[PDB]
Amino acid sequence: TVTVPKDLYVVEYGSNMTIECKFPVEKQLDLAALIVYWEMEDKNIIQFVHGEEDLKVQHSSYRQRARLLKDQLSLGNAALQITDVKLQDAGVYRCMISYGGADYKRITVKVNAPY
Amino acid sequence: YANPALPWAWXXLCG
């Protein structure tokens, strides 16, 4: 089962965020069995297939800001890091992990502008 | 889905 440590993030304008998305890993991760999808309101952020990614399919509004952290991935955490968080980044993020079965979770991100 | 070079849509659709 895919689990999330939390399903709501409130993150500061201009900061970096890491959204987590956990799945069961045994002694070692098998890339040949793993697909990860991160999506946000019809925008494709990460489309990871057995180790393979193609920047060309990443939605323009996440270019150079959004990546799947590979060290975490190796621990069963398909963590999406988004740098320089924008107000437009607020919304519902969806992760799908396929790894000995497919499951998914939804995560709300809110962006605050403290003063 | 699941060609990494083609847009997907939620869930496991082609975009």
Residue numbers in the entry:
A (entry chain A): 20 to 134
B (entry chain B): 1 to 15
Study authors write:
A key target in this area is a protein-protein interaction (PPI) between programmed cell death 1 (PD-1) and its ligand, PD-L1. Functionally, PD-1 is an immune checkpoint molecule located mainly on T cells. In particular, PD-L1 expressed on cancer cells inhibits the killing of tumor cells by T cells. Besides PD-L1 binding to PD-1, previous studies have shown another ligand of PD-L1, CD80, which upon binding in a Cis mode provides complex cross-relation between PD-1, CTLA-4, and CD28 pathways.
High-quality crystals were obtained for pAC65 in complex with PD-L1 that allowed solving the structure at the 1.1 Å resolution. The asymmetric unit of the pAC65/PD-L1 complex contains one molecule of PD-L1 and one molecule of the pAC65 peptide. The interaction between pAC65 and PD-L1 occurs on the plane of the PD-L1 β-sheet composed of strands G, F, C, and C’, as indicated by the canonical Ig designations depicted in Additional file 8: Fig. S6. The peptide ring assumes an ellipse-like shape with a bulge located above the central region and binds parallelly to the plane of the β-sheet. The backbone of the macrocyclic ring extends itself from the 65Ala-NH25 to 65TrpNAc10 while the bulge is formed by 65Tyr1, 65NMeNle12, 65Leu13, and 65Scc14 (the subscript 65 indicates the macrocyclic peptide pAC65). The binding interface of the peptide includes hydrophobic interactions located at the center of the interaction area strengthened by polar contacts at the rim of the binding site. Two indole moieties of 65Trp8 and 65TrpNAc10 occupy major hydrophobic clefts at the surface of PD-L1 and create the T-shaped stacking interactions with Tyr56 and Tyr123, respectively. Although 65TrpNAc10 binds within a prominently hydrophobic cleft, the acetic acid moiety of 65TrpNAc10 extends the cleft towards Arg125 and Arg113 providing crucial salt bridges with the side chains of these amino acids. The interaction surface of the pAC65 peptide coincides with the binding sites of PD-1 and ALPN-202 (engineered CD80 vIgD) on the PD-L1 surface, providing a rationale for the inhibition of both PD-1/PD-L1 and CD80/PD-L1 pathways. The structural characterization of the PD-L1/pAC65 complex showed that one molecule of the macrocyclic peptide is bound to a single PD-L1 unit, similarly to other macrocycles and antibodies targeting PD-L1, but unlike small molecules that induce dimerization of this target protein. The pAC65 peptide dose-dependently dissociated the PD-1/PD-L1 complex with an IC50 value of 1.80 ± 0.16 nM, a 40-fold increase in inhibition compared to the activity of the previously published precursor – p57 (IC50 45.4 ± 0.001 nM).
